[PDB]
Write a protein that binds this ligand. Structure first.
Ligand code: MG
Ligand code: MG
Ligand code: MG
Ligand code: MG
Ligand code: MG
Ligand code: MG
Ligand code: MG
Ligand code: MG
Lengths: 328, 328, 328, 328
């Protein structure tokens, strides 16, 4: 298949590497690749993480300086502030380079053209599929984990080799796997989850609550217990991740299976239409525009919605309850 | 009629003139009006065009300085960057003036209020209808060419005279003609072409290709030949510009005439509705907003569409083909 | 690929060839194939072209006689009168044959069954994609040009060889290319152009004119200049034929690109529906019926539409104008 | 106004005139213009009318011969057979002419292009608005009558003079009037009457009958009396032609006026839509096509409808009744 399981590590031996940011990801990847025998540095502004990283045994310079000393760099910072950082501090230093390599963990700012590096550069991508708290929990066991790979600009005919070398340097393989893809096929996915089934799920739950209360005389303290205040859902998520989504259902009662299957095959076209609409909205680049503009205006909608959600009835009831069960 | 064929040239004799930009238009108008005996200068930042213009015999200062020495100025630069240039460098110098004149080749930035000069100023407009490469090709023959005229702000009761004098100074007349109009009636037109029949044409061609291939088993190498890979279309354009749009069709076969006429009178209401929608969208000023905002966000949609078009199947086939016919 | 670049010429050496009609095509193909060393004759009724052809060095007999002396024939006459000519003069002579070959430049009258030659005959097709005025302009340079090939009836297992030999005899190759296709895949194309984007374009232009005049107070003398009275369109056609349809747009301004792309991807489904309708109307054979019947009635609709178009307002304004610019 | 009341008669004095057909119109116009002192002949095939016309004192030749001896001709025959007559017998003789004039009483065959005379000819039109039986009934009183005039082709700058001279020669003026119009504005009218209010009227009557019988238990012998078997309707027609359409209603009862006016202003949009549809169907030339084709097929629809109408129930009842009242 397209799949990769293990590969070489020679192209990075002798080269210096710079890691931007020391948040969750940066700390993790940096520590690991240090264990695998690589000269590593860090670039960050003087704050909490700066002290922490220099404490953990890392030589710390600030960003532009780190890019001067590096032949490779990992830009592990939020997708909301990477633009200014790149424009002010990196791009200059980068114009003054010969053979450089630039890695990202997300393809948002590139797939949509908010960042357009030169042609003197190898532009790549390495995207894990784990939060970071569990990634360490797995590295201790010699286990790997999955990632996605992508290449946007090859100026040296060696980009893929570099990407696989990186994947190995951070402990994703061997033990896990690595898939080859694009920047687009990753942004698309990271977004479609956040736009299709998460919000649909939440709205469905909220609607069930509202209905049961205002049309069948149910008590608030019970709806919550049935819907999400119990650990029903994490159970199901686990059995899904392990046994499979459908085979997970054998451990339930026949009645549940029947209702679930019927109503699933019954409401499939509706959500399909929805998903089409949203995926199309993304592929074109409209959502990026929307979001950037909202940033420029002052996040008013964000504010008002955060209010409306918490000032809803369900949330207040949840509050009273969690307090009652002792859950902080 | 409203029409003008030739006029005087006295108001500009004794005055100095400054031309902003030395691209296609600026170079042309400047050279010509120099031939017609006028003291002329140039304003531009130190780049390629700067060297070229000083080479061709023009005294070159940078912009604000040129506006100080000038009683008249031609703002011949793209409509996408004129705003900042006007705000930073011109408007100050202009506040410190007594009797000035400002000419544009496009009414976009003014019709929509992105540029609001003072009342101490005569604001005019001179818009040709030729690319510039052919304008010289015609000036050598003593031929004129058409233009549009407009006036937004008259502080001296002499604006129209100035406009006609300019039209004569650049060689549009006599030999061609000059129409009086507004800034609005020019922006509207320059846009409606770019929003109605050009994109409709392209979409129709693309649809014909896709259909013929995916439903009637046609080969890609043939659809292109019929639709646009042949010089069919430039032929028709020429006969239109010369003989007339309809009289052009006499040189075709009766079958073609019949089909064309029937389907034309048959699909006229649809496109009419479309054109209404778009013209209305413009008259109000919504498109300017849209475009300005996209500039402020980072041109994401522009990017994604440029990609989707070139990564289409038709374009790849066109590529293979053009390479085969030797066309670069 | 399916494509052909050059081939043999042996099957026609020793055979006599008859060319029907001496209009644009006939004259061209005849002259050329004569240059390539082939015994050639001509068949036509005694009129202007008759004198011209005998002047240019061709032995001229009238039609049935030419078919008697020929082992191969090219039926290069309009698709509107070929039927009677075939029925009265050719088919008899043809019943009295042994091994014959019949070539067409269009598949209309055959694809739809208005002409059904016997099985004693090899029925083929050779369709150029150039007007004829430029074909000579290219033959002088040793250049070729594209054509389409097709076969309807093979009684000798040598039809394709004959077709390629012909293509070579008229100077299409080498230098150009030749595509293999059907009679249907050529009629379909020659028509879909005349039914989809040409009339749509014209209607869109007309609608823009009408709107701009009757709802925004524009002058007629300006709308025309923007829309087609300028050579805007032939420019674009040229850049399309040479650089490519989309790459052509880089030489325009960003604003134009943006509007064009957006409105193109926005109005693609509509025209797609239209094109489906028309292509289907053709594939079935309904348009041929329509057109034949109109011929039988006396061309009343043709007449009335030719009137309505020229008695429109746009045409009268165009007339006044062209007269003013001196354009005949 | 556009209107004409009397005019000269000099252009026809000294010229010979030929009248084609001796039916209702031909007989009338011929007799009259003979009374007004004009050399007149007749052209017709040897049948009943031939004997009649030669009896009434007319020198009779057959058609082509009459056109040779004539400088002016009146083509007074049905619009269904004029085409062949023109093609076979007239057009030849006409090619061999110098200065000729051709008059019609209907613009059908010309407005739609079924007859296209040369440019060596003056093509005109004179259309009365009376059946012919009453025209004589009025000529005896020295009264005139209305007509329409039109010109399609002027080769002598004298067409209008000829038309008015004709109008005077047939006794339409003075006493009546003459309106200037086109061939189109006459065919359109002659048809729209036959397509809009006549058939609507008939269908409404038929529907009233059917309803009253099959839903309110009415007797057939009474519905007819109310609807049309009485002379109600000719009364109203007379008062319309004399007093005016609306002023006609004062002689009726208030109840009738009220109902009529209300329901008239209530059902005006519907019939307006209908009339638009039909007038458009005509202006384009589609009805002429329809009718010509039906002639070519054998009048099957005509046949079947003539049957269905007479085999209806209303017609049979009308038959029984008329027989009962003695009405033949
Ligand atoms: Mg995310
Ligand atoms: Mg995710
Ligand atoms: Mg433009
Ligand atoms: Mg334009
Ligand atoms: Mg054709
Ligand atoms: Mg074509
Ligand atoms: Mg009639
Ligand atoms: Mg009538």
């Amino acid at each position: 298949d397209k799949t990769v399981l293990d590969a070489n590590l020679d192209p990075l031996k002798g080269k210096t590497i710079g890691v931007i940011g020391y948040g969750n990801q940066g700390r993790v990847q940096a520590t690991i690749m240090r264990e695998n025998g690589l000269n590593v540095i860090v670039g960050n502004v003087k704050d909490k993480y700066y002290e922490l990283a220099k404490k953990e045994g890392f030589e710390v310079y600030e960003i532009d300086e780190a890019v001067r000393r590096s032949d490779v760099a990992l830009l592990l910072i939020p997708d909301e502030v990477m633009k200014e950082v790149y424009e002010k501090k990196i791009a200059p230093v980068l114009q003054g380079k010969k053979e450089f390599v630039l890695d990202f963990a997300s393809g948002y700012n590139v797939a949509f053209g908010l960042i357009r590096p030169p042609k003197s550069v190898d532009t790549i991508m390495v995207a894990p599929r784990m939060v970071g708290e569990g990634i360490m929990d797995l590295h201790k066991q010699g286990k790997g984990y999955p990632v996605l790979l992508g290449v946007k600009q090859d100026a040296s005919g060696k980009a893929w080799d570099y990407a696989k070398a990186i994947a190995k340097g951070i402990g994703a393989i061997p033990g896990g796997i690595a898939v080859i893809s694009s920047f687009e096929e990753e942004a698309l996915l990271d977004l479609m989850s956040e736009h299709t089934w998460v919000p649909i799920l939440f709205g469905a739950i909220k609607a069930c609550y509202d209905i049961a209360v205002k049309e069948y005389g149910v008590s608030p303290e019970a709806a919550l217990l049935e819907f999400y205040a119990s650990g029903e859902l994490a159970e199901i998520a686990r059995l899904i991740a392990e046994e499979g989504i459908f085979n997970q259902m054998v451990h339930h009662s026949t009645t549940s299976q029947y209702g679930t299957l019927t109503r699933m095959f019954k409401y499939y076209d509706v959500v399909r239409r929805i998903v089409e609409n949203e995926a199309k909205y993304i592929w074109d680049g409209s959502f990026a525009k929307e979001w950037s503009l909202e940033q420029q205006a002052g996040y008013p909608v964000f504010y008002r919605l955060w209010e409306l959600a918490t000032q809803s009835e369900m949330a207040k009831a949840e509050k009273e309850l969690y307090k009652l069960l002792g859950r902080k």
